[PDB]
Amino acid sequence: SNSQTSREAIAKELERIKESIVQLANTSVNGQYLFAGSQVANKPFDSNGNYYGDKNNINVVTGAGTESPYNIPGWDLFFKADGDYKKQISTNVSFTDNRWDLNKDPDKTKYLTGDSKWQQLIGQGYVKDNSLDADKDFEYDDSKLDFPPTTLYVQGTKPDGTSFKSAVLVKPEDTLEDVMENIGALYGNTPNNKVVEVSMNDSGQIQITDLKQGNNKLDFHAVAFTPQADTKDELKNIIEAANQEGISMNEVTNRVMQASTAAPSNGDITKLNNPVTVTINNQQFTIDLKQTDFIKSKMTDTDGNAANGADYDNVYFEKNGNTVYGNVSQVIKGSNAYATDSTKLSEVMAGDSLNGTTLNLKVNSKGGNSYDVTINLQTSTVSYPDPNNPGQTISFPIMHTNPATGNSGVVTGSNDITYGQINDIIGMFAADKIPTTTIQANNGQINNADYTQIQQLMKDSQATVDVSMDYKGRISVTDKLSSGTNIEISLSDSQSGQFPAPPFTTTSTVQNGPNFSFSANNSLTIDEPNVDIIKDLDSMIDAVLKGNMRADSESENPRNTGMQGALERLDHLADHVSKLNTTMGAYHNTIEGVNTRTSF
Amino acid sequence: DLQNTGILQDLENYNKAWNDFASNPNENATKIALVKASQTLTESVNNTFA
Amino acid sequence: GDIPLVNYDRTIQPGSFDIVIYDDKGDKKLTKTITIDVNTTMNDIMRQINANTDDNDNKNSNDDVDDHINASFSYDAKTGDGLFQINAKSGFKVAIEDKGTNFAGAFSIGGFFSGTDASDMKVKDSILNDPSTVRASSNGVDSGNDMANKII
């Protein structure tokens, strides 16, 4: 009986309890703050704040060279990597049979299972007349038809961390079991050894849980495309149209999609969404195309289009005040903490040299206008052509310091280039009187004065804007000369654009080559080693308020995440704190023994 | 051994931490507490030497 | 600066001290070090200090600790005496990591004491005025308790 307002009234006390924890989190012994790291008077938190304390321990010397630590710094609870726990990745979409329509049948709302053969939910999906007979066309096969397949892209992080670009088809009568066997092949979730578990969840979605302890950077996004006839009547025609042509329905699925890209105006390589007219038995027909977003929402892409499902990284940084960040974090190959400036490209890439490695950038600048750039770090090369005359171009190879002298100017080695230079690059997208360059890599040698002048403009640029690698690893930027940022960013890779090997079939096509990730329309999850109060509590409050067991994309919060997700997040947190709880007494009883024998 | 000297007791409870470690190795603190008891043990060998 | 290090002090031994430029906690794309033996002179020390003693070598320059450095003059012949300054920009924090070099603190280059024996040995008065200058912190503003502990 909890009306919405009822759920807030319940939530209010939790909100009080939330601050109760914040108060507790801010606790001190008369200024000896329990959370300060090593420095007593550090008041560590607020309702909306970060950890405010050192990370050394409060320590006292009693030794021939001995300290004595007796606390825990606040972060080590507040944002601590409780590395035992694993990713909970789920589809925001939910699935059902669709011969019935569930607006016809909202009370019914039956979810897919192994029995749910693929024909059934495409049943009405084939058509606009939406009148197909559930049994006699599909199951009471006295009058059943021929049927074509469906298409799917997939992108995700293999639990080890490797990248892959893949495409695959779905056959007309497929079931859950067909999906699972290919899933085992696709992820290496082998029968001999699994790496993640697959489930259909409490709310009707499809969920996967990771077996890898402390895996923070498991992510997923997928898109499926399908053709659509108009009429139940039209479909039977394609049997005869196709089969007397000598082909089942399945060939027809192939024709429309390729033609769309053949002139991308007919549906681009990635934005494939055009309805098309085609020939079967060289009878003329027109057909509609389906779009499927396994992260679907109230989305308009970075381009400003009503975002087409291919819009994964076609989303900007996520906005919070003067701060914007790519929620798709950059995370350590290990503890899964986050990046540092001097990290060369060598530490990052998958390859001996940055072969064919190249990147693209999108920037809606602080000056309003958008400035988008492409970079081949394989040659340490950055670029920009002139709008009026792109023939003229701006040349810059990446640069560095000397060993002992101002004897300067031979270009960086490709693999060596580091993260700090990235944040430096954002410094260039700063303001108003912005810079430009031109250089020749004379045996790599160049004029440092050009670099030095660039450096000086950068050292003045210090004040403009911030780049940060946050406590979630999210690729973060803050508008310093603002409390609300007039800036937006989006990035992508260009070994993408090159795809798995065609012709694409029901057997998965899988290729490698894209080497980095960016801000994108990522999977949904709240649980992982590292904690964060605001995301964990406030996101889960929203779901209770809306009553959404987990989520709703159309809900103002398109990433409403909680309620059912809270269960194991509680499983995580009970352990997370208990570890911290038992830790302190170990000091206390340890110190007792030392003091006691010292006393004696 | 007024108070059976720390080393021999460090070992003792350390070995108590062992049977605790058998209780739950997934409870990492069993390691840490176990490790600590030896830490007193070893450093106590070290100080006696000095 | 002519005088060699050991000749000016017989505690000087083969040692090194590193310099990582810091916010109250620090960084590693900007870091200098100075090297010592039982023979070298301050002039050499100043050369490692006051030069393009790089810390991010790949055959170019700039983008180092040197960003934080500065120097100045202030003297008057009306006195016949004056002040000469060697500094890094305050607003940055600093740390200095020594291994067996033993010179600067002894000669109170930033040391605690002035005077050499109980006739003149004394606390530096700035410390007498403000014990807050006794920040327990090696690393930052007061971002460390250690020094309080270390002197135990």
Q: Would you say A186 and A528 are in contact if contact means Cβ atoms under 8 Å apart?
A: no
Inspect the structure and tell me whether chains C and B have 3 or more CB pairs less than 8 Å apart: no
- For chains A and C, count residue pairs whose Cβ atoms are closer than 8 Å: 100
In this structure, what DSSP letter does residue A154 have?
Answer: E
Which chain A residue has the Cα nearest residue B43?
A66
* Residue C94, beta-bridge partner list: C21
CB contacts, 8 Å: C28 with chain A? 340, 342
Q: Which residues contact A97 (CB under 8 A, 6 or more apart)?
A: A110, A112, A116, A120, A121, A123
Tokens standing for residue A81: 């990597």
List residues of chain C with CB under 8 Å from any CB of chain A.
27-29, 51-64, 67, 136-137, 139, 142-146, 149-150, 152
Query: Do A408 and C61 make contact, defined as CB atoms within 8 angstroms?
Result: yes
Measured in degrees and rounded to the nearest 5, phi and psi for residue A4 equal -55, -60
| Cα gap A315→A519, rounded to integer Å | 7
List the chains bordering chain A where 3 or more Cβ pairs fall under 8 Å. Answer: B, C
Q: Does chain A touch chain C (at least 3 C-beta pairs within 8 Å)?
A: yes
Contact A252, A555 (CB under 8 A): no
Tell me the H-state helices in A263-301.
none
A439-459 as b/e: b if 16+ CB within 10 A: bebeebebebeebbebbeebe
With CB atoms and an 8 Å threshold, state whether A402 touches C145.
no
Which approach determined this entry?
Answer: cryo-EM
10 Å Cβ neighbour count for A584?
13
What distance in Å separates the CA atoms of residue A10 and residue A23, rounded to the nearest whole number?
A: 20
How far apart (Å, rounded) are the C-alpha atoms in residues A189 and A159?
10
- CA end-to-end span of chain B: 18
* Length of chain A as a residue count: 600
Burial class (CB in 10 A: 0-12, 13-18, 19+), A317: buried
The residues, ordered by sequence, that sit 6+ positions from A39 with a Cβ below 8 Å of its Cβ are: A53, A54, A58, C136, C137, C142, C143, C144, C145
φ/ψ region of A44 (left if φ > 0, alpha if ψ in -120 to 50, else beta) reads: alpha
CA distance C21 to C32: 8
- CB pair distance less than 8 Å for C58 and A412: yes
Q: What sign results for the dihedral spanned by CA atoms C22, C28, C32, C33?
A: positive
Phi-psi region of A378 (alpha: psi -120 to 50; beta: other; left: phi over 0): alpha
* Pair A374, A416: CB distance under 8 Å: no
Q: Are A587 and A69 in contact (CB under 8 A)?
A: yes
Chain C residues closer than 8 Å to A37 by CB: 143
Contacts of A255 (CB under 8 A, 6+ apart): A278
Query: SS3 sequence, C80-112?
Result: CEEEEEEEECECEEEEEEEECCCCCCCCCCCCC
Q: Hey, what amino acid is at A452?
A: T
Q: Per the CB < 8 Å rule, is A590 touching B36?
A: yes
Determine the residue of chain A that is closest to C49 in CA distance: A404
CB B41 within 8 A of CB B10: yes
Q: Of A498, A456, A400, whose CA–CA distance to A165 is shortest?
A: A498
φ and ψ at A140, to 5 degrees? -80, 75
Whether the bond into A503 is cis, omega within 30 of 0: yes
Which residues of A touch chain C, with CB atoms under 8 Å apart? 37-40, 54, 56, 58-62, 67, 340-342, 399-410, 412-413, 416, 418, 420, 444, 448, 451-452, 455, 459
Of A50, A45, A49, nearest in space to A28 by CA: A45
Assess contact for A512 and A350: CB atoms under 8 A: yes
Q: Which region holds residue A204: left if phi is over 0, alpha if psi is between -120 and 50, else beta?
A: left
Are the beta carbons of A175 and A117 closer than 8 angstroms? yes
Are A439 and A375 within 8 A, CB to CB? no
Q: C74 CA to chain A: closest CA distance, Å? A: 27
Nearest CA in chain A to C32: A404
B37: closest CA of chain A, how far (Å): 9
Q: Do A579 and B2 touch (CB under 8 A)?
A: no
Number of Cα atoms under 13 Å in the Cβ half of residue A118: 17
CA trace torsion A406, A410, A415, A420 (10° rounding): 40
Q: SS3 breakdown of chain C: % helix, strand, coil, rounded to 5? A: 20, 30, 50
Q: CB-based contacts of A235: which residues, under 8 Å, 6+ apart?
A: A126, A127, A145, A229
User: Which is nearest to A325 in space by CA: A138, A174, A466?
Assistant: A466
Q: How far apart are CA A188 and CA A162, in angstroms?
A: 12
Separation in Å, CA of A532 to nearest CA in chain C: 23
Nearest to B33 among A586, A597, A600 (CB): A586
Calculated CA dihedral for residues A335, A338, A344, A349, nearest 10 degrees? 70
Whether residues B29 and A593 touch (CB distance < 8 A) is answered with no
CA-nearest of A323, A320, A321, A326 to A302 is A326
E-assigned strand segments in A452-564: 466-469, 475-478, 488-493, 509-511
DSSP letter at A261 equals H
Look at residues A372, A293, A301, A327 and name the one whose alpha carbon lies nearest to residue A517: A327
- A213: Cβ–Cβ under 8 A, 6 or more apart, which residues? A83, A84, A85, A86
Structure tokens at A214: 């402390």
From the list A444, A378, A451, the residue with the least C-alpha distance to A411 is A444
Spatial distance between the Cα atoms of A292 and A223, rounded to a whole number of angstroms: 5
Query: How does DSSP classify residue A331?
Result: B
To probe the interface with C, which of A32, A33, A38 has the most C CB atoms within 10 Å? A38
Residue pair A278/A252 in contact (Cβ under 8 Å)? The answer is yes
- Radius of gyration, alpha carbons of chain B: 12
Q: What is the largest CA-CA distance in chain A?
A: 103
| B46 to chain A: closest CA residue | A64
Burial environment of residue A190 by CB neighbours within 10 A (0 to 12, 13 to 18, 19 or more): exposed
Exposure letters A339-376 (e unless 16+ CB within 10 A, then b): bebbbbbbebbeeeebeebbbbbbbbbbeeeeeebebb
Residue labelled with tokens 């101002």: A406
Alpha-carbon span A257 to A41, nearest angstrom:
65
Answer yes or no: are the C-beta atoms of A135 and A203 closer than 8 Å: no
User: Which chains border B (3 or more CB–CB pairs < 8 Å)?
Assistant: A
Which among C58, C62, C146 is the nearest to A413, CB-wise?
C58
Flag if A600 and B6 touch (Cβ within 8 Å): no
Q: What is the end-to-end Cα distance of chain C in Å, rounded?
A: 35
